[PDB]
Amino acid sequence: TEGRSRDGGLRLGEMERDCLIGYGASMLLLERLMISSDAFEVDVCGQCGLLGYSGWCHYCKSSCHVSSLRIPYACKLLFQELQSMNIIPRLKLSKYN
């Protein structure tokens, strides 16, 4: 929430993230802004490129290309909001190696 009157934590302003980038603390920045703010688990079908649930793909009606992915909850909300406008985001996954 907002602050002390609302028992809210502090806010990482843009400048703080700028300093973190300048230091290059990639994993620390990722943990601070994703793990410690809003962490979510999503499933993506490589065939369709669309989000899925519980290792299942409704659009492809299959579960042979699902995968797990950690995400900011705000990012998932943005994806779904963009979906509502029929601007469908198709995620093209790639192996980490």
Partner 1 sequence: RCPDCGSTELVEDSHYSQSQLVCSDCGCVVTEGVLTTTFSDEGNLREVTYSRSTG
Partner 2 sequence: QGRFRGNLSGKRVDFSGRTVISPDPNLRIDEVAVPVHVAKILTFPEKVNKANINFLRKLVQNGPEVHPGANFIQQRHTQMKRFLKYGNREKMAQELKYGDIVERHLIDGDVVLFNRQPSLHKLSIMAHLARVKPHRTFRFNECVCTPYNADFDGDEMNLHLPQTEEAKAEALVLMGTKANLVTPRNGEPLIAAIQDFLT
Partner 3 sequence: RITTPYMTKYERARVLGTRALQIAMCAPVMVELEGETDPLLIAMKELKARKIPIIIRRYLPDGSYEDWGVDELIIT
Task: Using CB under 8 A, pick the residue from 1, 84, 86, 97 that binds partner 1.
Answer: 1
Contacts of residue 16, defined as CB under 8 A and 6 or more positions apart, other chains included, come to none
Binding map of partner 3 across residues 12-51, x = CB under 8 A, - = no contact: ------------xx-x------------------------
Binding map of Zn ion across residues 16-45, x = CB under 5 A, - = no contact: -----------------------------x
Alpha-carbon span 94 to 62, nearest angstrom: 19
Residue 43 to residues 6, 13, 31: CA-CA distances in angstroms? 33, 30, 20
* Residue 6 lies near partner 1 (rule: CB under 8 A): yes
Question: Taking the CA atoms of the chain, what radius of gyration do you get in angstroms?
Answer: 17
Residue ranges at the known binding site for Zn(2+): 45, 48, 57, 60
